[PDB]
Amino acid sequence: AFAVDAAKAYKDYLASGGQPITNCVKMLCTHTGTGQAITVTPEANMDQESFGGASCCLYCRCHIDHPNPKGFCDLKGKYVQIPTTCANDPVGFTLKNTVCTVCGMWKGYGCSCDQL
Amino acid sequence: SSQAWQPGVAMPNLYKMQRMLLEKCDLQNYGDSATLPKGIMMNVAKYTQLCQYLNTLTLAVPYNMRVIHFGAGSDKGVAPGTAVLRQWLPTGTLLVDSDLNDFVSDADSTLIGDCATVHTANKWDLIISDMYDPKTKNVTKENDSKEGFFTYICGFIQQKLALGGSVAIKITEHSWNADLYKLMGHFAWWTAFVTNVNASSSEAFLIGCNYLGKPREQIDGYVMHANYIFWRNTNPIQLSSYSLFDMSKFPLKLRGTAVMSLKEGQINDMILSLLSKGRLIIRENNRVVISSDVLVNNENL
Numbered sequence: 063a064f065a066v067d068a069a070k071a072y073k074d075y076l077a078s079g080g081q082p083i084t085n086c087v088k089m090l091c092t093h094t095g096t097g098q099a100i101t102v103t104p105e106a107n108m109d110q111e112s113f114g115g116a117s118c119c120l121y122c123r124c125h126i127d128h129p130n131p132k133g134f135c136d137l138k139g140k141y142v143q144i145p146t147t148c149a150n151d152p153v154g155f156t157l158k159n160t161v162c163t164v165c166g167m168w169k170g171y172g173c174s175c176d177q178l
Numbered sequence: 179s180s181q182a183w184q185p186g187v188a189m190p191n192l193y194k195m196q197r198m199l200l201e202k203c204d205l206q207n208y209g210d211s212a213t214l215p216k217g218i219m220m221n222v223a224k225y226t227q228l229c230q231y232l233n234t235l236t237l238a239v240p241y242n243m244r245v246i247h248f249g250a251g252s253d254k255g256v257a258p259g260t261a262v263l264r265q266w267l268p269t270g271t272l273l274v275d276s277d278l279n280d281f282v283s284d285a286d287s288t289l290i291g292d293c294a295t296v297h298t299a300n301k302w303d304l305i306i307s308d309m310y311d312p313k314t315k316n317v318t319k320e321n322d323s324k325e326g327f328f329t330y331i332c333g334f335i336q337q338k339l340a341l342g343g344s345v346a347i348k349i350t351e352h353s354w355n356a357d358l359y360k361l362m363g364h365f366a367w368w369t370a371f372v373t374n375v376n377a378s379s380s381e382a383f384l385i386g387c388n389y390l391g392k393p394r395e396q397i398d399g400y401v402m403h404a405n406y407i408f409w410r411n412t413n414p415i416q417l418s419s420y421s422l423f424d425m426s427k428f429p430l431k432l433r434g435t436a437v438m439s440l441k442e443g444q445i446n447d448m449i450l451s452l453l454s455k456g457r458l459i460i461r462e463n464n465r466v467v468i469s470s471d472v473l474v475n476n477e478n479l
């Protein structure tokens with residue numbers, strides 16, 4: 063019944079003033095892309111930065127199993143678009159946020175499916 | 179002049195044709211650094227300009243392309259170069275990378291250990307190596323052709339590089355190998371490319387374009403490295419990050435290059451001509467299987 067909870071550990075470490083994980087691999091791109099959250103190639107728009115996925119995954123970076131029962135990683139081998147204002151902590155951002163399964167945008171950072 | 183707006187500078191042909199003696203490398207702008215875009219690593223910028231230059235050559239780009247990347251780990255535990263290669267290569271390209279120490283990567287498969295422990299059943303369309311030991315930067319000792327991972331790379335090319343494939347191998351003043359220069363003569367074209375972001379370094383990427391599996395021209399590797407250092411010594415390259423800001427044409431073009439299985443007897447001049455133009459790859463198209471040799475030891479008592 064014991065499983066280490068790294069997501070909660072990083073969240074608390076952040077709340078208590080810890081330096082976010084560094085050396086997330088930021089890509090050069092046009093910044094005229096679709097803006098979607100996780101893509102097979104950099105897709106940052108004017109308000110985002112594109113990163114290599116594995117370097118932004120808490121589980122990859124910490125050498126710990128992925129919460130997926132299959133161990134599969136949502137980020138490895140892909141590229142994650144981070145809002146420029148949050149690019150100081152890509153790992154924290156991808157951890158705390160969710161991708162809209164309809165439009166592929168970050169919930170609350172581009173997803174307008176719930177607007178009327 | 180306009181060199182500052184290119185991704186880098188390639189060794190001009192006339193310098194390849196000289197018979198220089200090896201001298202110490204003395205770069206005018208040693209120690210200077212280019213101004214990278216905000217928050218961009220040197221290695222992202224370096225690999226980006228490498229790929230931008232590779233876009234100007236006649237690379238074979240088949241469906242289900244196979245690329246292997248040696249020396250892919252940084253001291254930061256991540257793989258910046260691999261991330262650029264995967265961005266550059268067409269989506270779906272099989273990308274394997276390797277390094278001595280553990281690192282997290284976006285490659286489809288990653289092998290940890292000395293490159294001599296890496297084995298693959300299949301052949302490859304593109305080999306990238308950034309392998310380097312900084313303890314070769316000893317100026318107080320003579321600068322001879324190095325072996326180590328260069329011996330592996332030379333054999334890996336001759337054994338596991340598909341005809342028509344290409345390579346880009348990192349060298350420096352002291353990190354070089356004569357047989358690798360000689361192997362450049364087994365491609366339809368070759369050069370030593372210096373990225374504009376790292377122009378203050380004796381680093382270059384030895385690029386072999388379209389592998390032919392036989393000597394097209396005879397190259398003395400000791401002379402050619404001396405030729406390279408002479409070029410570097412007499413041609414200051416202006417550090418520049420200009421090309422990093424235009425990525426609109428960055429993706430490698432999926433040329434759909436044809437892949438055939440052929441036998442040494444069937445390689446005629448029509449074939450060799452197609453290979454030389456980046457229009458043909460020769461290898462089997464089976465599944466890609468790799469492995470890392472593991473030494474077993476019991477240290478108890």
Ligand SMILES: Cn1c(=O)c2c(ncn2[C@@H]2CN(C(=O)[C@@H](N)CC(=O)O)C[C@@H](O)C[C@@]2(C)O)n(C)c1=O
Pocket residue numbers: 203204205206207208209315317351378379380
């Ligand atoms: C190890 N190594 C070097 O040392 C080196 C070098 N190119 C030039 N040099 C230094 C430069 N130099 C310095 O003082 C530097 N701090 C910066 C500067 O002034 O260029 C003094 C100068 O007399 C010449 C030389 C050779 O000594 N390359 C490629 C290299 O690999």
Ligand SMILES: C[S@@+](CC[C@H](N)C(=O)[O-])C[C@H]1O[C@@H](n2cnc3c(N)ncnc32)[C@H](O)[C@@H]1O
Pocket residue numbers: 221249250251252253256257258259260276277278279291292293294308309310311326327
């Ligand atoms: C500076 S690093 C590569 C940087 C990396 N390409 C990047 O984009 O950040 C040079 C690498 O060469 C690797 N390497 C060097 N010699 C090797 C050898 N014989 N076998 C396996 N790996 C080697 C080193 O471990 C080292 O990690």
Ligand SMILES: [Cl-]
Pocket residue numbers: 083123124
């Ligand atoms: Cl970490």
Ligand SMILES: [Cl-]
Pocket residue numbers: 194396397398399401402
């Ligand atoms: Cl020669």
Ligand SMILES: [Cl-]
Pocket residue numbers: 440441442460
């Ligand atoms: Cl063959």
Ligand SMILES: [Zn+2]
Pocket residue numbers: 116119120121122123128135136137138
């Ligand atoms: Zn992961």
Ligand SMILES: [Zn+2]
Pocket residue numbers: 162163164165166167173174175176
């Ligand atoms: Zn949505």
